[PDB]
Amino acid sequence: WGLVFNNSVPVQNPKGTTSKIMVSVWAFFAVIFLASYTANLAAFMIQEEYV
Amino acid sequence: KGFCIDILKKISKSVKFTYDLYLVTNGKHGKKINGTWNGMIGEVVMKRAYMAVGSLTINEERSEVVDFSVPFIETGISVMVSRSNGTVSPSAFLEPFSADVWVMMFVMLLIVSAVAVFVFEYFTIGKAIWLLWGLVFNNSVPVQNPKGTTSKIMVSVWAFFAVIFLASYTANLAAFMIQEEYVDQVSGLSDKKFQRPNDFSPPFRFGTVPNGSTERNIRNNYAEMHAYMGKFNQRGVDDALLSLKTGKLDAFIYDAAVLNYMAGRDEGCKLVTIGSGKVFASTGYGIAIQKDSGWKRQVDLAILQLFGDGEMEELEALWLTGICHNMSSQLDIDNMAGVFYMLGAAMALSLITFI
Amino acid sequence: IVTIHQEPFVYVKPTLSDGTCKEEFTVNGDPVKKVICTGPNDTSPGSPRHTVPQCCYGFCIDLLIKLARTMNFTYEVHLVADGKFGTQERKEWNGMMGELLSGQADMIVAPLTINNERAQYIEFSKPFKYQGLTILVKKELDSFMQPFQSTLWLLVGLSVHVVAVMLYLLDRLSSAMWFSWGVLLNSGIGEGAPRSFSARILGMVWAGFAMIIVASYTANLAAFLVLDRPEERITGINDPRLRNPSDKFIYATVKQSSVDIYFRRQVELSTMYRHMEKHNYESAAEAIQAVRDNKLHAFIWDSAVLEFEASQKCDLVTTGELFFRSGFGIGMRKDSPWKQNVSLSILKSHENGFMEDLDKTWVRYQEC
Amino acid sequence: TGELFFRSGFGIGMRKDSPWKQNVSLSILKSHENGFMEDLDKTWVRYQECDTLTFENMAGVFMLVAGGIVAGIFLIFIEIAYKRHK
Amino acid sequence: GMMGELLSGQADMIVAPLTINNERAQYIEFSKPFKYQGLTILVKKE
Amino acid sequence: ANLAAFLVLDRPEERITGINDPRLRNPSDKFIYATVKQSSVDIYFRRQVE
Ligand SMILES: CN[C@]1(c2ccccc2Cl)CCCCC1=O
Ligand SMILES: *[C@@H]1O[C@H](CO)[C@@H](O)[C@H](O)[C@H]1NC(C)=O
Ligand SMILES: *[C@@H]1O[C@H](CO)[C@@H](O)[C@H](O)[C@H]1NC(C)=O
Numbered sequence: 001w002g003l004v005f006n007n008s009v010p011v012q013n014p015k016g017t018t019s020k021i022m023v024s025v026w027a028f029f030a031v032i033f034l035a036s037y038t039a040n041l042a043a044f045m046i047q048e049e050y051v
Numbered sequence: 052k053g054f055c056i057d058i059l060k061k062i063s064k065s066v067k068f069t070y071d072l073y074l075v076t077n078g079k080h081g082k083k084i085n086g087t088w089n090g091m092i093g094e095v096v097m098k099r100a101y102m103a104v105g106s107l108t109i110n111e112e113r114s115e116v117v118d119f120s121v122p123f124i125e126t127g128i129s130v131m132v133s134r135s136n137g138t139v140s141p142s143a144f145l146e147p148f149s150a151d152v153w154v155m156m157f158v159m160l161l162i163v164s165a166v167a168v169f170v171f172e173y174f175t176i177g178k179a180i181w182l183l184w185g186l187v188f189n190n191s192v193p194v195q196n197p198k199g200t201t202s203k204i205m206v207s208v209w210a211f212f213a214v215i216f217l218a219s220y221t222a223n224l225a226a227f228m229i230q231e232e233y234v235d236q237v238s239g240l241s242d243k244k245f246q247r248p249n250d251f252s253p254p255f256r257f258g259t260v261p262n263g264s265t266e267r268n269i270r271n272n273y274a275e276m277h278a279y280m281g282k283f284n285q286r287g288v289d290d291a292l293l294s295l296k297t298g299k300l301d302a303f304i305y306d307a308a309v310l311n312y313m314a315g316r317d318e319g320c321k322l323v324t325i326g327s328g329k330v331f332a333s334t335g336y337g338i339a340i341q342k343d344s345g346w347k348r349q350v351d352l353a354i355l356q357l358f359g360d361g362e363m364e365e366l367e368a369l370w371l372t373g374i375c376h377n378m379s380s381q382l383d384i385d386n387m388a389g390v391f392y393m394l395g396a397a398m399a400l401s402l403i404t405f406i
Numbered sequence: 407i408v409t410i411h412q413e414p415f416v417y418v419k420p421t422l423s424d425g426t427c428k429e430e431f432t433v434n435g436d437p438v439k440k441v442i443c444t445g446p447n448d449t450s451p452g453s454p455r456h457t458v459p460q461c462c463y464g465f466c467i468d469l470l471i472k473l474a475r476t477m478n479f480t481y482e483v484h485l486v487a488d489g490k491f492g493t494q495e496r497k498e499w500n501g502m503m504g505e506l507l508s509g510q511a512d513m514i515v516a517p518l519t520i521n522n523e524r525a526q527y528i529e530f531s532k533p534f535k536y537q538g539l540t541i542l543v544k545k546e547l548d549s550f551m552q553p554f555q556s557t558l559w560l561l562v563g564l565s566v567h568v569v570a571v572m573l574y575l576l577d578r579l580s581s582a583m584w585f586s587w588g589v590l591l592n593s594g595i596g597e598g599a600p601r602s603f604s605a606r607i608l609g610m611v612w613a614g615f616a617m618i619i620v621a622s623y624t625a626n627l628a629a630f631l632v633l634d635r636p637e638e639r640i641t642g643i644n645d646p647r648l649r650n651p652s653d654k655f656i657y658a659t660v661k662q663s664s665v666d667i668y669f670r671r672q673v674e675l676s677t678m679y680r681h682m683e684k685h686n687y688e689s690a691a692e693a694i695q696a697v698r699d700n701k702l703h704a705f706i707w708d709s710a711v712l713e714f715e716a717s718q719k720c721d722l723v724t725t726g727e728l729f730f731r732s733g734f735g736i737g738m739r740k741d742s743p744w745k746q747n748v749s750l751s752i753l754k755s756h757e758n759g760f761m762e763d764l765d766k767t768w769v770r771y772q773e774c
Numbered sequence: 775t776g777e778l779f780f781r782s783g784f785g786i787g788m789r790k791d792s793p794w795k796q797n798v799s800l801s802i803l804k805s806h807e808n809g810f811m812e813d814l815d816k817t818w819v820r821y822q823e824c825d826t827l828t829f830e831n832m833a834g835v836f837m838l839v840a841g842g843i844v845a846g847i848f849l850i851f852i853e854i855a856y857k858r859h860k
Numbered sequence: 861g862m863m864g865e866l867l868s869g870q871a872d873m874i875v876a877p878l879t880i881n882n883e884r885a886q887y888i889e890f891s892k893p894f895k896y897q898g899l900t901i902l903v904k905k906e
Numbered sequence: 907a908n909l910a911a912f913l914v915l916d917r918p919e920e921r922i923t924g925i926n927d928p929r930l931r932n933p934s935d936k937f938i939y940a941t942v943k944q945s946s947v948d949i950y951f952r953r954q955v956e
Contacts, residue, residue: 003592003593007189007192007592007594010192010594012596017580017581017584020584020587020588023593024587024588024591024593027588027591027592027593028590028591030592031591031592031620032591035620035623035624036624036627038624038907039225039623039624039625039627039628039631040628040631041907042222042225042624042628042907042910042911043628043631043632044907045907045908045910045911046632046911046914052677109803109892110803110807111800111803111804111807114799114800114803115800119892121885121892122783122892122893124781125781125783125896127806143618143622144618148826148827148828149827149828149832151829152827152828152829152832155829155832155833155836156832159836159839163839166843170847170850177601177606180606180610181598181599181601181606181609181610184609184610184613185613188610188613188614188616188617189592189617190589190592190612190613190614190616190617191588191589191593191594191595191598191613192594194598199850201846201849201850201853201854202846202850204842204846204849205839205842205843205846208838208839208842208846209839212835212836212838212839215835216832216835217617218909219827219831219832219909220621221617221621221624221625221910222909222910222913223826223827223913224621224622224625225621225624225625225628225910225913225914226826226910226913226914227625228622228625228626228628228629229628229629229632229914241809268807271807272807272808272809315646317647317652317654329812329815331809331812332806332807332809333806333811333812333895333896334803334806334892335783351885351889352882352885352886355880355881355882355885356882358882359881359882359883359949359950359953359954360953360954361954361956364779364780369646369649370646370650372646373646374645374646374647378629378632378633379633380626380629380630380633382552382553382554382555382626384557384558384561386553387553387554387558387622390615390618390619390622391565394565394569394611394615397611398569398572398611401604401607401608401611402576404604404607405576405603405604405607628910775900775901775902775903775919775920775921775922775923775924776900776901776920776922776923776924776925776927777898777900777923777924777925777926778897778898778899778900778924779898779899779924779925779926780879780898780899780950781896781897781898782879782880782881782893782896782897782898782899782946783880783892783893783894783895783896783897784877784878784879784880784893784894784895784896784897785878785880785890785891785892785893785894786873786874786875786890786891786892786894787866787873787874787875787878787884787888787889787890787891788866788872788873788874788888788889788890788891789866789872789888790867790887790888790889792872792889795889795891798891799891799892802891802892802894803892805894806894811894811895815895826913861944878946879945879946879947880946881946881949881950881953882949882953883946883949884946899925900924901922901924901925901930903921903922905917905919906917906918906919
């Protein structure tokens with residue numbers, strides 16, 4: 001959950017260079033999802049439905 | 052029937068006379084073929100028809116043989132090429148707005164790094180700079196240079212300010228991305244590319260249609276342009292528009308009114324005109340009259356009276372108003388080439404500094 | 407009473423073998439059973455058909471029941487095989503207007519537009535539902551990477567690989583690539599840059615690239631999302647495509663209706679009708695079915711039912727200015743003594759909001 | 775803003791039944807033929823031409839952090855004094 | 861006004877920026893136009 | 907998102923849609939007309955009763 005949101009104090013649970021691929025791809029997916037959510041919110045903020 | 056038919060009907064209503072419209076026997080418009088004109092000009096100089104109505108562009112050669120009338124619609128020479136799809140300018144790395152904001156952020160980073168170094172003293176400068184960069188760009192977690200907690204307030208508030216600045220930058224970029232200027236690679240006949248396509252780029256065609264006043268004007272103005280366009284002599288109007296839509300024809304250099312009408316039709320969404328009001332050889336479609344009996348004054352006065360009233364404006368709105376006139380955002384590699392250029396320049400600067 | 411088979415106002419439903427069918431209950435409850443109507447089996451599809459009694463409730467049945475209760479008169483609802491509304495002969499009237507002229511029905515309680523000729527021949531009293539004419543057109547979600555494409559993805563991958571390998575080429579290893587991959591998208595590693603001679607400068611340079619690229623991606627996808635398709639393709643009669651007929655576009659309207667009278671009223675609109683007089687349809691249901699399959703570009707001059715059809719279909723959009731402002735009325739014979747009574751009854755019903763209640767209970771039920 | 779409801783062309787008015795009307799008409803047509811009027815317009819209008827983030831959204835945070843730096847250093851000094859006197 | 865300068869006799873040409881209407885063409889001819897423009901309304905920017 | 911929405915709030919400049927604008931066509935106390943005196947504008951306005 002640390003990589004999905006604003007960075008916090010991390011834990012060095014992985015031990016080795018062969019386990020960083022999973023956390024790296026998870027972080028990439030999380031940041032892509034966060035960027036998409038922010039862009040969707042920005043697009044919806046200018047909607048004319050609100051009255 | 053048509054716009055000219057409506058104009059003739061209005062003239063007949065204003066001035067009572069008898070008319071008998073006759074289709075053109077040979078040719079389409081005037082052309083000095085071995086000293087003999089053809090089309091409407093050839094008919095009017097032969098006393099077959101005293102009045103000529105149609106797409107007769109007013110020029111010195113035409114006015115020399117047959118007198119003209121007051122124009123009612125402004126036309127000229129225009130270019131309508133839209134095959135190329137140009138995205139926004141690559142200003143993502145450095146947009147025109149907030150030009151000094153980057154320098155202000157840099158000097159603020161330097162100031163806060165100096166303050167952190169000073170309070171730590173009471174490799175430190177490099178550590179403070181790295182911490183500031185990590186807090187600003189949020190690319191990676193920076194190493195906490197300070198050891199105490201009292202000084203952490205300054206770094207926390209600076210990181211919050213950097214986050215706010217980054218959010219403002221993202222919002223400004225999003226606001227700028229919605230612009231639909233669509234600056235195409237079009238400059239007009241004054242550009243050297245259109246004047247000499249062979250010298251500039253062999254994959255280019257003028258596409259000027261011969262047998263017309265515009266073709267004669269282009270040939271008189273520039274012989275090289277006429278020679279280049281002679282290899283791409285299109286036939287008709289609908290065929291040329293279809294060729295341009297399919298991409299076979301590079302551009303259309305016909306009349307401004309015809310180009311505007313074509314762009315305003317169904318097959319004009321991807322074939323818009325130049326978009327500039329000023330056009331080359333700004334003239335009109337004046338009625339050609341021999342003026343032997345002095346009847347040009349009456350028709351000129353009638354045209355002026357019609358133009359003074361709102362009938363001409365509403366008629367033009369009904370007829371000379373196309374569709375899909377003037378965000379259609381598109382993505383291109385040239386749009387994102389700016390960040391690549393900035394990265395390359397930064398890498399070159401870093402390599403120079405290291406060496 | 408002569409009624410037209412307009413589905414939004416008069417639905418068509420054949421009766422069972424018992425001579426009557428029970429209407430399904432609504433949310434409010436206590437449904438009103440429609441009276442027996444001797445309508446054509448298939449509205450005479452080019453061949454004669456038996457006048458089998460059918461149940462037709464629709465929308466006008468409640469209005470007719472209210473009028474009958476107020477005036478205390480018996481009624482006999484029946485349809486017409488021709489199905490025409492009414493127009494000039496070819497010196498008489500055809501369809502519902504022809505039936506009224508022939509004396510078959512002394513009154514007509516059905517959705518019918520009013521024009522100059524119809525108002526001259528018969529009186530519509532006061533309209534109950536106002537509707538301005540409008541056009542309907544059959545209306546005709548991004549990539550996972552937005553501005554970047556396959557070529558752009560390959561280019562950015564090559565660039566990031568090149569900078570990653572150059573990092574450890576200038577530093578000197580294998581850990582540099584892992585560090586770059588970790589710091590490309592948030593995350594982070596405990597090693598960091600060496601910051602000996604020029605590593606700090608390279609790290610600072612390669613720290614804002616990710617923010618810039620994600621901001622550009624978000625901006626591009628937001629711009630793509632706000633690229634809404636144009637709905638108002640035709641701005642009523644003011645649109646040049648509508649004003650000037652074209653071979654590609656097809657204009658469809660209900661035949662033998664007030665549309666022909668309205669078009670013939672204006673001389674300047676003659677080219678709008680004469681050039682497009684062979685594309686008319688005798689029934690609105692056939693035109694709706696044809697336009698459902700995108701065979702017809704657009705439909706006009708049936709707004710009071712076109713809006714309901716668009717709401718039910720949820721696919722066809724409705725645009726265009728309300729150039730022709732009028733309302734549906736109830737028709738009576740010439741010098742009919744009941745005209746004043748029905749006018750007073752309909753005005754009283756409209757005053758208390760009964761028409762609004764019926765609208766909100768039937769038309770507003772299907773919202774899409 | 776607004777559409778052009780009167781497309782009027784500035785003309786060269788002369789005396790009634792002037793014998794120089796043909797010459798001036800030919801000259802004004804030749805002016806459009808070679809683009810002299812277009813050249814003059816491009817020389818004049820283009821030369822006399824002219825045209826969101828600023829310090830309002832940028833200098834505010836800098837001023838706030840500059841003001842808060844004094845409070846932070848004062849708090850640090852107070853904490854140091856308290857620790858020394860503890 | 862200015863139109864009287866081309867009829868009283870103090871001048872022979874009226875060469876200046878002047879819109880063409882249906883009244884000035886009654887007796888004196890303006891030949892052909894050299895610059896087309898459309899009448900537009902201008903307001904202060906917000 | 908709210909900052910982006912605020913930044914794309916362009917100032918409305920097309921207050922008057924030409925001579926066809928009902929606000930400008932209909933005279934009002936707040937609105938004040940202006941034109942060049944003794945010019946073609948007066949002739950054009952007085953040419954038609956509209
Ligand atoms: C992670 N960084 C971003 C971010 C996303 C969401 C919230 C805050 C931030 Cl800061 C990524 C999306 C573009 C803007 C940006 O800086
Ligand atoms: C113009 O048309 C005439 C006949 O209409 C034809 O003989 C002549 O070759 C044409 N000229 C060009 C340049 O196409
Ligand atoms: C650019 O425009 C052309 C024609 O206007 C079109 O064929 C092409 O798909 C467009 N490209 C993009 C990326 O929108």
